[PDB]
Design a protein around this ligand. Structure first.
Ligand code: HEM
Ligand code: HEM
Ligand code: NA
Ligand code: NA
Lengths: 713, 713
């Protein structure tokens, strides 16, 4: 069946905004996972998980009689898809059970791991999501094997179809760099937003960069990809060495024995894949990565043996039985146990990427510190395992259950507790009137509140107006935020705040985070009033102000909007057309197409554009909340052409006289071009739609203001 | 961006069940189009449309100063995509404004037509849908030019994204037959469900079959495609000659002048396409099809001059200025007016397909009758135009407005009026108890009610339980319906009905259509009872019984289920895997993936399979409504393998002992294979799911029972 994608492969794809509908979700529209989880007997689940560890099934026998290593790898891959660039991937939606990740090469045989967990999933049902279960099982594996974890939070709700993620452009699994769709250019620069070296890998190639077994050059890829997963050098060394304290790799024979990945397998395989024709196909004969390495003398118990081995031998390059590059300890005795045969032992072995930890000079210093101080190693790994597995969960308000660590961590972008009474309706009316009396304009108030709130992304639930981090480094300096205008708005708001707070009795006070949002609401009200409409914009207080010391400036950089079609802003020239970037931003904001349409049309006439650009400002009454953008956009009296100077700017001229009426960008005109967007614009550009437009705009505005409000919702 | 479709291009696609979500719809959840339409001033809309016919815009000047012919074509293409095989296509969802239809080659310059209607669409807003407007404008065009129409119904709600339709497998627009993706095989057999001869055409090639200008062979393609659009010989001749009473074709110069279709055009084109570099690019210079034919001496007025010309001259094969084949009247005077230059006249011209109406001997008889009796011709055409533009609207209860024709037409599958009091809740309880006391089993009651209700298809809104047409030819004899078992059930239910109706006072009575549905409800209640669960299944009376004389048997044939995965039924061997056909049936029933999953699992254990096949009957308590299908399917203790005899049947054996536990088809096992369906099955197979399963099954059962109940809309 030929589809629209086949005929017009570069048209914009709006279906990413309408994923995750009530249609595809088997749970009722009222189902609340948090509530179901809070009633789970978590201790019972963990008892069943402990039992499972050593209950070997014949269809995938447990190495060393213990599945712990398999399950640690499973949890680590669940978490490992995360990219800091967009917040996409990670463990938080349980996506490992869906395409493509269920069938990525690096997820080979983790289908077996997941199937071993079905009986537990079945027994506890909706009260523990797969997403939570994959992480908790990893925790229990570590505990079962003697490692004390730093804690665990539940609350990852399951999802029901695959997430739309750009994982790269290659059309071949595992394609090496420099192909026609290379993710690399120049001096090994990985394209944003990617965070892995080859299509279908989690981070790096375990043989070395594009297969070349150089531990020093492998280290470079490790550092880069782990940084792109929000992990620094100490955390990276702790995780790799921590992980590889356990279990083993699987490469007992050639890879040509292994058949189709799960999404390609026959219907009879019942959701499993990588069926192997080598000997028994499993256990002692297992083939997963192709490498055959077992790191420690006690693969089912926490130990300090990884760094003893790493530093205590010299390493020789060799090949696994499948032909992969790996390393064996020069002159060592056979001290490593076999996974199935008590009469066999093996010499110590390492991956290229393990040797990175010794041969990269910066890693070597950390690795030695961990070798010499194993308690520091254990604490770093526990903290890093928690960060790994929680980094995409968002504010601590979302963390459920009785094992949540009390310690607040910088990477959680923490927001202080509110400890005082909040403002009430009367106070909010007072503050709005003071904001409007100050002289701040509709444009300034709307722009500032937009800038504060629209950093939120639903991918990892970072960002938003809570915290008032717009006043801090680095947000206060972002170009999209118009630093000098921003500074003037914040100054006036801060004086309003000070005065209001100084007049109160009791502990009552308003946060700047709340006042930024409320001032934006007053701007929207005033805009509606300018259009001759009475409107009330909802507002929920309770935001708090974070400090600069609670705001990691390097981690904040990934939230900078380099493209924001809602403010007609593009920081540079990008490979992707601007309308694609708009739909991407709408997705991170959790907006549907109709919400994206309404919001952008409104923002245009309110004066939210960066730099007060006239592009898309299709009204003669700026700062009035009207549907003018749609009515003027859709007017067939006007003809549009790209300009001389710039193909991405368009001039709209009267079709009869030739006179210039407007100018717009691609983000503006896509609403007049794309056949689904134009159908939306038509509704809001119709003669009966002014009230609809206002009321839809206010709703989506309030939606955006509340995106990070996990303390309420 | 590599997608799951790219990696696994043959995996089943569930996203067709989740279109049309509340997310993509700009109207509120409570918007009711019929309520908006009933307050439209339809007379005022028609006055605007009438004025528009002769108000020429310079960006697309009106031929002869009158847009009528353009709008008639626009409405005929809106309607002309309809296929009787699946009910997909037609005018009823306004799909011409979306991809792909908006950019089909046969819809060339209809973008102009639709744009001319924006100012009226804008004026009346949500009270008239684009879908309705397209058709109304065609009617008003005919009226304006002196043709009396048969009527008009409103009620086609707008849609907001493209419909998923199989339009063929060709990868090149207009590809001639016999390519690698040929829609033809054998002796010019067009593949079901297609209804056109080439990709991107409405019906046939106006030059002749694959461009060969032979009228006799063209007639064969006309007859075949029109039949596949539910039009017979009389209706086809009336429509083609009726249409071609008006307007003209456009081929003033070569087609290489014409640019990209709308979905490929630049953003500045603002949703228009086929921009032409030939001279002015429009009006007198217009290029649309490439043909340059004007059929009558008064292209803007109804006449009987198409047949006067057709029979009054001999025709010579010629070429248009673009090079297309077309026909000119041998030795005729220049009597046909020019579209822009009052001092020029042209000889009569015809398409190959026009001459079909004279040179195919069956067509010729009808055409002569219409020539000699033009009042017969006007009546046939009015009736056929109404059928053409309404054939996918569904039951007459959906028809809105003051111009709906009072005559009931056989092609409507008419349902008699109900003229007596309906049964009440106490009566329904009494009849359920009588049904259960008769000895009819859960399996019989469920099977029969399923058979009657599951003929519905949301594509053209035909079928469903209303009418009790399951008791009539041809439904009573369809294999899927198990004719001998059916007849026994219907006999017993008819005795129950007779006894209940005979005992009443006061005119109250129950129809057989209602009793068949109610009995099915009693079966599902009894199944729930057998499982230890008291539930009440909703039931809405008001169905009526249609007669054999009100049932067109030949038109009913397309509703026969030759594949019904809900009854594990496949009438023959198909190129398409059975799972794909299941998802296709789910789409026609308007089911989401969770609804399809719950319903199939339930039906299995209720005994709804055709022929009492054991395939998928994964329970040891058949006729009890339990989640056993999912629990047993998902049990890893069972291993599945295709059978020797049949690759499409699978044996489930105990993994340890080898003992045979079950058998199933592809339709069964897909729920344990496909990654998204298995996630659904897991919900209903969990230990906490019995109440959910029951409730969701009752909901979807009731939904299916009510699919055609537009009288309660
Ligand atoms: C540079 C980063 C890493 C590389 C290249 C990498 C590579 C691999 C490979 C190839 C395997 C063998 C798969 C098989 O054949 O069965 C594996 C196993 C595993 N890795 Fe990693 N790894 C990395 C980091 C991690 C991290 C961060 C963790 C956890 C904190 C982790 C924990 C595991 C464990 C427990 C296993 C053993 C699986 C079993 O016993 O079945 N590794 N690693
Ligand atoms: C065998 C069936 C049919 C064929 C092959 C056919 C073919 C065509 C073609 C090739 C054009 C010229 C497009 C252009 O160059 O502008 C056209 C025009 C037209 N057709 Fe048909 N047609 C068929 C049936 C119908 C029917 C069923 C109707 C309506 C009842 C219809 C109404 C018209 C009208 C009104 C125009 C004139 C458009 C104008 O004035 O701009 N045709 N036809
Ligand atoms: Na994420
Ligand atoms: Na249809």
């Amino acid at each position: 069946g030929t589809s629209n994608r086949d005929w017009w492969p570069n048209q914009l794809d709006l279906s990413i905004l309408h994923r995750h509908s009530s249609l595809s979700d088997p749970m009722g529209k009222d189902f609340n996972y948090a509530q179901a989880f809070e009633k789970l007997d978590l201790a019972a689940v963990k008892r069943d998980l402990h039992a499972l560890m050593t209950t070997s099934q014949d269809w995938w026998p447990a190495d060393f009689g213990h599945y712990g290593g398999l399950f640690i790898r499973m949890a680590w891959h669940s978490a490992g898809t995360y990219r800091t660039a967009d917040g996409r991937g990670g463990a938080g939606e349980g996506q490992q059970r869906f395409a493509p990740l269920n069938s990525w090469p690096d997820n080979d045989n983790l289908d077996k791991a997941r199937r071993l967990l079905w009986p537990i999933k079945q027994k506890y049902g909706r009260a523990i999501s797969w997403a939570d279960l994959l992480i908790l099982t990893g925790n229990v594996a570590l505990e079962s094997m003697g490692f004390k974890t730093f804690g665990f939070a539940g609350g990852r709700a399951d999802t029901w179809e695959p997430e739309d993620v750009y994982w790269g452009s290659e059309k071949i699994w595992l394609e090496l760099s420099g192909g026609p769709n290379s993710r690399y250019s120049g001096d090994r620069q990985l394209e944003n937003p990617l965070a892995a070296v080859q299509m279908g890998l989690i981070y790096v190639n375990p043989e070395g960069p594009d297969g070349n077994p150089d531990p020093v050059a492998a280290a470079r890829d490790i550092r880069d990809t782990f940084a792109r997963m929000a992990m620094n050098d100490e955390e990276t060394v702790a995780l790799i060495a921590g992980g590889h304290t356990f279990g083993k790799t699987h490469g007992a024979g050639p890879a040509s024995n292994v058949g189709a990945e799960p999404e390609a397998a026959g219907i009879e395989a019942q959701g499993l894949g990588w069926k192997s024709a080598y000997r028994t196909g499993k256990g002692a004969d297992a083939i997963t990565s192709g490498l055959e390495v077992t790191w420690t003398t006690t693969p089912t118990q926490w130990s300090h043996n990884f760094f003893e081995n790493l530093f205590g031998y010299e390493w020789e390059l060799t090949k696994s039985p499948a032909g992969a590059h790996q390393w064996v300890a020069k002159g060592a005795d056979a001290v490593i146990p076999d996974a199935f045969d008590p009469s066999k032992k093996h010499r110590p072995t390492m991956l290229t990427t393990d040797l990175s930890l010794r041969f990269d000079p910066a890693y070597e210093k950390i690795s030695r510190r961990f070798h010499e101080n194993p308690e520091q190693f254990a604490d770093a790994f526990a903290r890093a395992w928690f960060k790994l597995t929680h980094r995409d969960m968002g504010p601590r308000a979302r963390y459920l259950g009785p094992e949540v660590p009390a310690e607040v961590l910088l990477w959680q972008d923490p927001i202080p507790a509110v400890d005082h009474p909040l403002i009430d309706a009367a106070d909010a009316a007072e503050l709005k009137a003071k904001v409007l009396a100050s002289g701040l304009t509709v444009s300034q108030l709307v722009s500032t509140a937009w800038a504060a709130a629209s950093t939120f992304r639903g991918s990892d639930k970072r960002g938003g107006a809570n915290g008032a981090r717009i006043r801090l480094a680095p947000q206060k300096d972002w170009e999209a935020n118009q630093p000098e205008q921003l500074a003037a708005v914040l100054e006036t708001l801060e004086a309003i705040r000070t005065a209001f707070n100084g007049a109160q009795r009791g502990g009552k006070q308003v946060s700047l985070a709340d006042l930024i949002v409320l001032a934006g609401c007053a701007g929207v009200e005033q805009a509606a009033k300018n259009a001759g409409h009475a409107v009330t914009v909802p507002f929920a207080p309770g935001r708090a102000d974070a400090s600069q010391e609670q705001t990691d400036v390097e981690s904040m950089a990934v939230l900078e909007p380099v493209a924001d079609g809602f403010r007609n802003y593009l920081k540079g020239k990008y490979r992707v057309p601007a309308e694609v970037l708009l739909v991407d931003k709408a997705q991170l904001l959790t907006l549907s197409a109709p919400e994206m349409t309404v919001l952008l049309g409104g923002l245009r006439v309110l004066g939210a554009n960066v730099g007060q650009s006239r592009h898309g400002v299709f009204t003669a009454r700026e700062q009035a909340l009207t549907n003018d953008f749609f009515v003027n956009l859709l007017d067939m009296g006007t003809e549009w052409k790209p300009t001389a100077a710039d193909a991405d700017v368009f001039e709209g001229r009267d079709r009869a006289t030739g006179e210039l009426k407007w100018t717009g960008t691609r983000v503006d005109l896509v609403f007049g071009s794309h056949s689904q967007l134009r159908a939306l614009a038509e509704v809001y550009g119709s003669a009966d739609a002014q009230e609809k437009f206002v009321r839809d705009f206010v709703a989506v505005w309030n939606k955006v203001m509340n995106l990070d409000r996990f303390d309420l919702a």
